[PDB]
A paper describes a structure:
Type V myosin (MyoV) motors move protein complexes, organelles, vesicles, and mRNAs along actin cables. The C-terminal globular domain (GD) defines this class of myosins and mediates the majority of cargo interactions. In vertebrate [name], the GD also mediates autoinhibition of ATPase activity in its cargo-free state. In this study, we describe the high-resolution X-ray structures of the GDs from human [name] and Myo5b as well as low-resolution SAXS-surface envelopes for all three human MyoV paralogs.
Residue numbers in the entry: 1461 to 1639, 1658 to 1855
The structure:
Amino acid sequence: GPLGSMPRKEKDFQGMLEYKKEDEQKLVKNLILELKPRGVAVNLIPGLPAYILFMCVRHADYLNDDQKVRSLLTSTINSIKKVLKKRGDDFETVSFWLSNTCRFLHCLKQYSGEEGFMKHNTSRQNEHCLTNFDLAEYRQVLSDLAIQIYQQLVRVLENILQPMIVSGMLEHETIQGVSTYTLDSILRQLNSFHSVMCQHGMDPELIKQVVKQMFYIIGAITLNNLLLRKDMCSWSKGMQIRYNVSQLEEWLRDKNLMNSGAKETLEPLIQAAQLLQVKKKTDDDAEAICSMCNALTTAQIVKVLNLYTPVNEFEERVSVSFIRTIQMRLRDRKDSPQLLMDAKHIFPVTFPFNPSSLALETIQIPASLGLGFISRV
């Protein structure tokens, strides 16, 4: 039936989107620069802007149009940087663009046509692979861009967290008979950060990295305050920290994040709290401290013992002899000289490939996005 029949059947959409060269700057403006992150569509389908962008890349490749391909990827990358500069003080917008930049990168891989990335693809998804261009070079650029966005997300979340840490982990006291933010404030805030990331469809492997980084920041700020303040080094602070850490650990358990590396970053703080609790008088007490505090430096152990504030009914001041016993024993240990931890340290981030089951041929364009000048192919 190669000739025409009536009625004429509507075409079967292939999951591509065409646009006119003259409309490129409008396209990125509407889909990136002035896109509302709280829009219904882009939250019902997390990563929608990235998918739409990819579908557009797809049509340009289909037409074997190298010039349109180059121009679109360059506009897409520059616009993402643009919106990150203007709006990057806000956690929501940075989480949103980190997630869409990752999804865009994942799409470039999943539909590259390279066999190594096609492994979880359906037959249909494989029909959607690029056929004319190798975009490996652009992927590296997007990954570097994603590294920069992550570092900004960490700066944003640190600025929200930092004022809560000391107050929440150290200063709130309820213990009786033994001598503003709470632990709940911190737990709620971690919950909020994590809920937003999940709702944005951020990679679970990336979310795990963000969580490890947030727990590192908690532990480092808290421990640095113990090492600078006499009033924070006491048996009862030790008990309160021990409990606060247990709740943070239970947050990890509840969210199934026990593999994020988050817990392990608390180990110095944990051992400091334990040190505040143990006996500090005899040679045996000293040996036990040295073998217990394997994750603290000699400088940190010694500092805690010097600052230690005794409650006389229960204990005494730590003696100069005892500290000298600790120092002699720790001579055989080859430790780091650090006293304070670097609370600004950022673990290097990775973006392991996370293919999607979304079927591009089922995507439709909502009017709200202001993209009527685009058409489906």
